[PDB]
Amino acid sequence: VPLDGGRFATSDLNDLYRRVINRNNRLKRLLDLAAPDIIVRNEKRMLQEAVDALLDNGRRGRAITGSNKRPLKSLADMIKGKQGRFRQNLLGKRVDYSGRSVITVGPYLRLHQCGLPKKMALELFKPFIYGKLELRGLATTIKAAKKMVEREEAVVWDILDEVIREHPVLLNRAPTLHRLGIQAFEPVLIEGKAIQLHPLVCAAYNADFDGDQMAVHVPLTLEAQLEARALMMSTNNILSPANGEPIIVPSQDVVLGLYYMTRDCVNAKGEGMVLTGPKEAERLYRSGLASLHARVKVRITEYEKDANGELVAKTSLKDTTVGRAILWMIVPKGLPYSIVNQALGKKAISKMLNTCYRILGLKPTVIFADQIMYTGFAYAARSGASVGIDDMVIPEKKHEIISEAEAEVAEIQEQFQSGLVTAGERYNKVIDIWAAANDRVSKAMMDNLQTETVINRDGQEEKQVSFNSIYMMADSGARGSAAQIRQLAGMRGLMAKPDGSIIETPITANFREGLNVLQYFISTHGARKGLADTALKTANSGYLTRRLVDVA
Amino acid sequence: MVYSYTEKKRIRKDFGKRPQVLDVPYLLSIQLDSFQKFIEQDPEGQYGLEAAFRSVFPIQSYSGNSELQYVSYRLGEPVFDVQECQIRGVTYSAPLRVKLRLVIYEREAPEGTVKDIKEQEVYMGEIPLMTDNGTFVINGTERVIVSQLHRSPGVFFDSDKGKTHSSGKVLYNARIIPYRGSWLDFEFDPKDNLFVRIDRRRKLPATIILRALNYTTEQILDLFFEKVIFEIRDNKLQMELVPERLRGETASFDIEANGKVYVEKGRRITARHIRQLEKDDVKLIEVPVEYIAGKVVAKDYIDESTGELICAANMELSLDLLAKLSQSGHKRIETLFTNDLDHGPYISETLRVDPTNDRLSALVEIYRMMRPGEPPTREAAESLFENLFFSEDRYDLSAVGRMKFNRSLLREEIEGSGILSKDDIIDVMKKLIDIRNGKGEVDDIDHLGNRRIRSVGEMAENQFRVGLVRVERAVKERLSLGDLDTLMPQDMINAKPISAAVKEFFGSSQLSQFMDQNNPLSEITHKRRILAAGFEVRDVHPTHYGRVCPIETPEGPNIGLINSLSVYAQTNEYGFLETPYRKVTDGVVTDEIHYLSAIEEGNYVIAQANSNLDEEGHFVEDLVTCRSKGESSLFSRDQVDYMDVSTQQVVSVGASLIPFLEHDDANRALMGANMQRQAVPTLRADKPLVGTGMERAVAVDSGVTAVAKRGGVVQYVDASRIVIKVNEDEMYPGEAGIDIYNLTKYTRSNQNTCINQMPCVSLGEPVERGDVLADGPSTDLGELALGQNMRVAFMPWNGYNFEDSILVSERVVQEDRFTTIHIQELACVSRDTKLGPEEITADIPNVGEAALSKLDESGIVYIGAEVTGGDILVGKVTPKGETQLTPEEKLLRAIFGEKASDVKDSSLRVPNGVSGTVIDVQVFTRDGVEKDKRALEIEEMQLKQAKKDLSEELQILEAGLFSRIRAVLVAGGVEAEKLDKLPRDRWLELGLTDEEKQNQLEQLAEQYDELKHEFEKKLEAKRRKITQGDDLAPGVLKIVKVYLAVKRRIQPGDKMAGRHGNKGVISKINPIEDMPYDENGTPVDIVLNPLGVPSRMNIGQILETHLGMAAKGIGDKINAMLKQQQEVAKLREFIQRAYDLGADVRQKVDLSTFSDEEVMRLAENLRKGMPIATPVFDGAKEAEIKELLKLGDLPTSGQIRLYDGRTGEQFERPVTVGYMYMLKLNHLVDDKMHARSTGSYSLVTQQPLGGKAQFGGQRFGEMEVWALEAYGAAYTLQEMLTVKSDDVNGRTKMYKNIVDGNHQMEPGMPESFNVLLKEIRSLGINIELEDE
Amino acid sequence: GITKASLATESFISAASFQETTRVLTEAAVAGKRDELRGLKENVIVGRLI
Amino acid sequence: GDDEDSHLGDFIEDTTLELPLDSATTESLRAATHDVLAGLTAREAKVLRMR
């Protein structure tokens, strides 16, 4: 086939095939010319070389294509490849009716839907739109319909709402691992060029918002619509196939909301009073009378289905807080109030959803999950949680701890100068005292940070778990952990030199303070080895799945 | 010095203590210096074209005594200048004109020449030139060549312990790596047999090379082993004993001499016995006849009588052999000294495995190793072996190779032969054996003394070298048969051969790449970049300090394979990496700078960048943190030889721009310096509110801005140009002068961003040399602004900030501050087809008057006409004849009476969805085709525009010169009112009294007339360049390039990040009504999610916020006192207070500044905010920040009360609000976004392919197939890989059903598999589809 | 082992996918092996219902 | 590019094919003219189908 500028391009087989013919033809000629044996023999070998080169090149001489150094690709190389066949192997054929773009949040979505940019949906459903436009008679013929959507006439948007309504679309992320890497959603028309994705699904995809892009696929055939709705739909897979635990577990902001919601301080507005029910509990809070967390007895109606397929009801005065009272409005039916009466960390908040599923079934759990997300985001916003530089509290005893551990190293050093201890024995020892020191500082700042809220109810004092911002993050299960916190306030670790040994002079400073030149430079290897290890081990993991799916 | 003129406009408050002893050098040094060394006239073999010439020259013919030598070279003026070269698309290059001298020696000489013709400057090739900014133009596009990091030439001794054989025992191998020529490898084995292989080829016993050097066995043992002397004196075996030989051995018999028994049998010989023998000087002892049973005889031994060989060299003696050589009269027998611990018997065992015997044998066995299978020949083997390491042609180490070679061998000479000598090979072997013996150590590849840095200059020389060798063969070939005086040094030397060596490098090579220019930092951080396998080389090495940046590297498939150059690093004289240091003599820190290479720095003890010294500069503490040999520990007060120059020198330009870097984890720091290069410039260049102090240096050193050549007062200021009237002290006597800066205006960058300069100075203002005249894109008043700082609040907002997502107030998009300007280059080609030529004519079948409106009579959109998606930019139509229509189409035309044209519509139309304004049109035409109307209009416009510019030059220039004549005439003959009356042209007649002023008038006269004619010649050349038909590709008749300027603001989907590694994607654009506001009522621009801060440990982003808040305070305050119009006194007082800030900083400050005009202007620039400088590791501290917040009127906590704009109610807890600098990276959502319904299809296999820039469908992979297989979805998968893609039938049968309202699929067979069947069937394989 | 057990698959069209194509095709072609599909990999190649 | 198995031949689109968004309109235009030819007299349809 011709190209631009009048140049031609052709497969290498021609160059190969051509050769096989010539030599062959020449041999036919050389028979009728009665040539000597030494020649027809050479010609036969030449024919053999050409045929071999044609079928699979590289098993003899590796014939090279005309005027181009690169060896010409033979028929075996067309089938062959990396690995095996090109057709279904990654990758693997392009597919119509698709698209892709940067993704954003869209917290308003129900778990069964997703925000779809207007322009993308127009180009995606073009055939559906064409056929629907002339089914109702808004367009004379298919061409006139094309001109309508090409003109983007205002009337077409409503027709699109018809073809979109019940019509799931497939969403996919870049490293598809388990089956949840593709999930079906109901499309919601959205102005703007970004795809909006329900937060609760963000866990199954391992999709951050730092600019990851996602792909869309339209399920054309009827069987695909019903497969998507009855198999690949979001609401029909809420549980990891690896383990029955819910994969729809609320992620971070939502759980930070609920943690701040059901929690209690020692003295707060409305402490001790009693209310008829959750309705007037919210009325107390929203109006500004009562604080979100205060210890209060309120009448609640819980349910237990412990009868035979039948929901029993029982009412009592529960000792609780205002937030937990408000939150109860969401919990459906047959769950006992015991589940919401705790502090609701990220761990407990998952077992809540799980039990809800194993008791009331699927449908009640979904609408439950939605509500949990909405309320989590909402109340977290009311909370005004933030992170300041004064939110990271360093122990008052740190400098002293460093000094005591600093004496230890000079003691063992004095023992090595006098030969009381061998060089190797010294190293392990010094390393041990510094390590112990790290533990000492860690369990110091942890005590100070955790409980240091000291507040007054009617008396002199009392002390509860701190309301300091960063602790709530780490405590709730939202984000952060004792290891990372330790790096912020207390000293961070003892890094390791490239050969795998660990340097006997740890990083005595932390991030709230400054790191000097050396400390940072030593930190680099850990970072560099971290990034390298993950980036390589990511590929390795995939390889594992490959062998596995082949063997199964 | 003590503050410039644009420094009086705005000054950055600088925290930080450590005084800067050295200031940041030119950041582009490497790129410019290298190329500067390549092309230059150097009267010697120092690297350059001169050196590359002097290597291959002189070229003599084959035995014909016809020699061609090289005289000198020159670089002709460039064909096109830098700007013109970009538009046309050719390369920016200069002709290389080299004088050659052809001598022919009389045949059967005494050497003398029949005739010698000197061919004047034969032209070979055009070599590219580097821009003043350090870039190259290959084809119309600025490209940068990244410096490379490779293994330095020399010798290297490695280990290969562990993995081999899993027996331990290690191994020791040496490798000789020349700059050019074959590799020579030496290696041991588990049997302690020394082996050698040339390149990676078959392993061979080491000794086989020594034989090829003409060394017999006797001399091999004599070289690598010592001599144990055995004497037969009187009778039965005495022996010479060196008393040290008994260390590490146990007595094998009675060791006795001099009538006294020193050691008995079975008593190991320790230091005591050895002392006795050493001090008693025992030369000769009695040994048994059985001890030589193991000892290997050194030399050959023959029987004097029978003349037959008794025992050959390197043979183990036995008790019977001793008898056969004793009766022949042999008194002495030399044996090897062998110790399995100290001096190993390796070579001895290597000889027993050697198949060869003599030199020819080794040469045969060597030649057959390199080129096996072919019969060896003596002349062939000799030629080969001498051509490998001994030939000046095929082998060179050059200077660096020889130096490190000699250096690693503990030699004296630092420079020597560029080939290998027998002495060299022997020495290398000696060193390898010494390491195996335990004395000495092995090097490591990762050390930066073994890593050499190349760069454009060095690399181009190699390619030019390659060009000269392939031309060398030709010159000799022609000079072989040459006739005497007919040919000359032109008919021989061609152009295409040499030019193509250099052209193939810069054009396509992994090291030559498009400059990354979306951002000044991107440029300057690209031009400093390095390139180099397992984790060892990727990892950070102790030697990287001050040379390679630890934290700036890409995160991905290649980590630590790139790095970047450090701030103060410099290429060593020999090409290593050296860094600045301060010499500490006695107890004082001296400010003399000293550059130490990687190996140089090793032994010295170097102090820390952060240290406390005072007064005379004595170390305050009795011990200070230092690093000595590959490790760091506390060192005593007076030991240290040197000290770090600055606190920054460890990092790179990228990392040095992150404020409070010391507070951020290295992972996020990497990502930050990785992302900062992606910041697209903005519409309004802003300024960083929080900063480092490098931003000024990065802005200036990169050419994006326009720097003053000479100081003076601004004569004229226009948005186009700037004319400076030079001060006389800075001015040269002749021509007088003024400096005219022609500013770059709106134009396309490589990344399609806008690069536009703005004048930063005002009419008639004093400017000093080295001051910023005009800012470039993303630079403000001489600093580097990659974005715009804004008010930010940390708090979850209804989940819209969920992961990293960013929630931005409408105020931002309304202020148009994050708006970005893109310039896209669209092209229209009128080609030639066998059916006919394509026309740019404005007559297009089937288009309305509204479509053709925006086009002129010629068919090209008017300049400046705003267009949207679908508008026709260029009308184009191509012939397609005999359409061959069908019955119903024919009726259609019959009813509606349309004449279906013989031409099909190819016209260039605006891509879908993109909308902008047309800022330019170019018309390229084949030479010989008539330029159309519009094209001629353009040419006329360019002509007139050219004349105006050149005339502007001459007009301002002439006045500048005559204004000086006026001044010189008034000295010695002053007439004030009289002089300016008569016509200015008549001034040149007046002379002067005897003085230099008469000669000054002379000078100005000469240069005046020169300008008059120089203007003339410049105009002519420009005109010809306009009218000359541009050279195009084969087949293309004409090309129309349209330039659209789209202005995109910000929308959900764009990527945004701070300098601290926090990414984000704008989620919702929220109204100002719903924005959290403070009690004062001022809303907040951006709401970040706090949850991202603890997990990713970057605490600077918080500090950057806090200090930022404080900074804005000092700004806001001034904004009040300026709106109060208090007075200069009150303002002056308050500002001074700010710049001191409580104690011990390096800033100093004013009351030297003019109290009125200078002070009031400064405050006006500070009212937006108070620029603060946080040095990288010297940066401010919490206390300093809190105190500035006290002066600010703002709380120490940095948190305030905020109110939701919806309910108006308060927010529980205070939230942190402040000012964070934020960049807009270019991932912008309306690029990434693609959607396709039914597009084009690939021909070979029918599969979706974008041909229209309507993108091919999404790629559905194998992993996604598994995902469908895990679900029970069969039909989705079939439709995915059959009807939606690969089925050329199923696709159409499907589409028709979709419009009919029937959702089904009639799948058929994917064409891919259908091809595999024929491909298999094309072989001898019969593949059928069975049954039913 | 997993990588060894995956070697044996009755359907040759599947094996030609992830294994070395040349050897698979030949070794099957001599015996006149008749691939019945019945598996996943092979049915995906040919483009019919899993 | 990319060194990936993407090869020049993979980018050469098929120009001799007919896009389905068109082929659909051909099958429609047949139905169109066939409808409009039944709106005329039997001889006008015959004469026009003949011409």
Ligand SMILES: CO[C@H]1/C=C/O[C@@]2(C)Oc3c(C)c(O)c4c(O)c(c(/C=N/N5CCN(C)CC5)c(O)c4c3C2=O)NC(=O)/C(C)=C\C=C\[C@H](C)[C@H](O)[C@@H](C)[C@@H](O)[C@@H](C)[C@H](OC(C)=O)[C@@H]1C
């Ligand atoms: C001729 O060079 C090409 C390939 C050589 O082949 C090959 C095998 O040898 C390479 C060399 C020698 C590199 O030094 C290199 C590289 O330094 C780099 C990336 C990684 N690139 N990215 C790719 C895009 N992506 C979205 C982000 C990461 C590379 O892949 C390579 C690379 C190769 O792969 N990266 C960086 O340095 C960092 C972190 C920033 C880069 C700056 C900008 C981005 C680039 O300069 C752009 C403007 C162009 O210059 C490139 C497009 C070059 O292409 C051309 C024609 O100019 C490309 C290097």
Ligand SMILES: [Mg+2]
């Ligand atoms: Mg990402």
